[PDB]
Design a protein around this ligand. Structure first.
Ligand SMILES: [Ca+2]
Ligand SMILES: [Ca+2]
Length: 419
């Protein structure tokens, strides 16, 4: 019964942990290199640039760790307001989080640990109370500096929703109409959206502007995850026969759109991207169930299960995709950084071994020469030789630790970053 979102949660913690270890390892390496480089008793076995490079990598790794700590899954919802996309988000969250059509901007729902909802617009990080959904709606309408290119974050309490605790963000978009100016949308707000949900009506033809947007999604993102939720499916409660016909036809239209028109999916998983739902039915049932209220429509259990099925296939989709797209570049960077430090330690090991061999040979030659200070001078070179030997041992250990991290990273890649 574990949410598939736990795959993301698990991978995020695992990659953050590796970067913690990578940072610790580079720190130890930097400390070792610096100490070595400052050793005025030896001919140089490392260089300032190697020290600076490894301090530089430490900085970069800590910087990346900060990005990795904040990475989250994002699903973005699109479509006409009248088709109910906001109710789909509300149903998924088991509550009336977003106002539902009678909202200018993008609404980005994020979990907060605080026990009260509030808004954060983004050009100004200034909040607005959102004690109720009506007061939320009025707070957006009150704010006339808002438009369909503004994003407000709806900070919604963690405790109410496990989706939000598992680092899911849910973005509602402005409702689409014919002349909705939306070519800004993908670059400004959707580059990090792991899933795009089109919420449509099974019987209403898709607007050209809606199709145009999902063309742009398919042109701008690499293998974007597109779901089509065909809302108001509860009409099947009273016209099951006609809605079954509608289902077959629209299932085929949506498949052709996803597979042939957009080319973002095979036919084999079309049934996993195209769902027929009744969001407000689900949301109503969930609001009552959350309170222990009892309860109805014909086909209701079937429609509730379909929505739950959508949710599960969505959570599997977003969790697996987001892990891949949001961690793969940093996993690759981490391997490159590990390899850079590995090779410096190998360079140091080798220069220390070469200088050791040199000092051993200087020791043998010293024993061919005058007996004045011979034992003192052989001892000083014995000590240098033993430092060079310890440096080699230390560098080999650090080099093998870099290989360990490469191995952790390879295994993370294998488990979490497959196509
Ligand atoms: Ca360099
Ligand atoms: Ca030897």
């Amino acid at each position: 019964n574990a949410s598939p979102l736990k795959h993301f949660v698990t991978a995020k913690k695992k990659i953050n942990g590796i970067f913690e270890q990578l940072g610790a390892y580079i720190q130890e390496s930097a400390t070792f290199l610096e100490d070595t480089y400052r050793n005025a008793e030896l001919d140089p076995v490392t260089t300032e640039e190697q020290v600076l490079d490894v301090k530089g990598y430490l900085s970069k790794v800590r910087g990346i760790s900060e990005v990795l700590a904040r990475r989250h899954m994002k699903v973005a919802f699109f479509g006409r307001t009248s088709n109910g996309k906001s109710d789909v988000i509300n149903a998924m969250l088991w509550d009336k989080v977003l106002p539902s059509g009678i909202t200018n901007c993008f609404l980005r729902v994020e979990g907060t640990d605080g026990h009260e909802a509030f808004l954060l617009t983004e050009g100004s990080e200034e909040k607005r109370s959102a004690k109720t959904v009506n007061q939320l709606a009025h707070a957006l309408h009150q704010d006339k500096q808002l438009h369909a290119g503004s994003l407000v974050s709806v900070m919604w309490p963690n405790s109410k929703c496990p989706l939000l605790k598992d680092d899911l963000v849910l973005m509602d978009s402005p409702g689409i109409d014919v002349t909705t100016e939306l070519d800004s949308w993908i670059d400004k707000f959707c580059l990090d959206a792991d899933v795009f949900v089109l919420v449509a009506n099974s019987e209403s033809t898709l607007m050209q502007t809606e199709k145009h947007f999902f063309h742009k999604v398919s042109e701008r993102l690499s293998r974007p995850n597109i779901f089509i939720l065909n809302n108001r499916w509860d009409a099947s409660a009273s016209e099951p026969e006609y809605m079954e016909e509608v289902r077959r036809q629209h299932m085929e239209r949506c498949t052709s759109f996803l597979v042939d028109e957009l080319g973002v999916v095979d036919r084999s998983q079309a049934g996993d991207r195209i769902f027929f739902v009744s969001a407000k039915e689900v949301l109503n049932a969930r609001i009552q169930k959350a309170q222990g209220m009892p309860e109805l429509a014909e086909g209701f259990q079937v429609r509730m299960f379909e929505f739950q099925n959508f949710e599960r296939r969505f959570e599997e989709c977003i969790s697996q995709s987001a892990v891949k797209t949001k961690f793969e570049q940093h996993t690759v960077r981490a391997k490159q950084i590990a390899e850079a430090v590995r090779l410096i330690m190998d360079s140091l090991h080798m220069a220390a071994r070469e200088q050791q061999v040199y000092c051993e040979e200087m020791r043998e030659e010293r024993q061919d020469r005058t007996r004045e200070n011979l034992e003192q001078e052989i001892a000083a070179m014995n000590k240098k030789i033993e430092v060079l030997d310890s440096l080699q041992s230390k560098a080999k250990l650090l080099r093998n630790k870099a290989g360990w991290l490469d191995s952790e990273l390879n295994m993370f890649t294998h488990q979490y970053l497959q196509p």
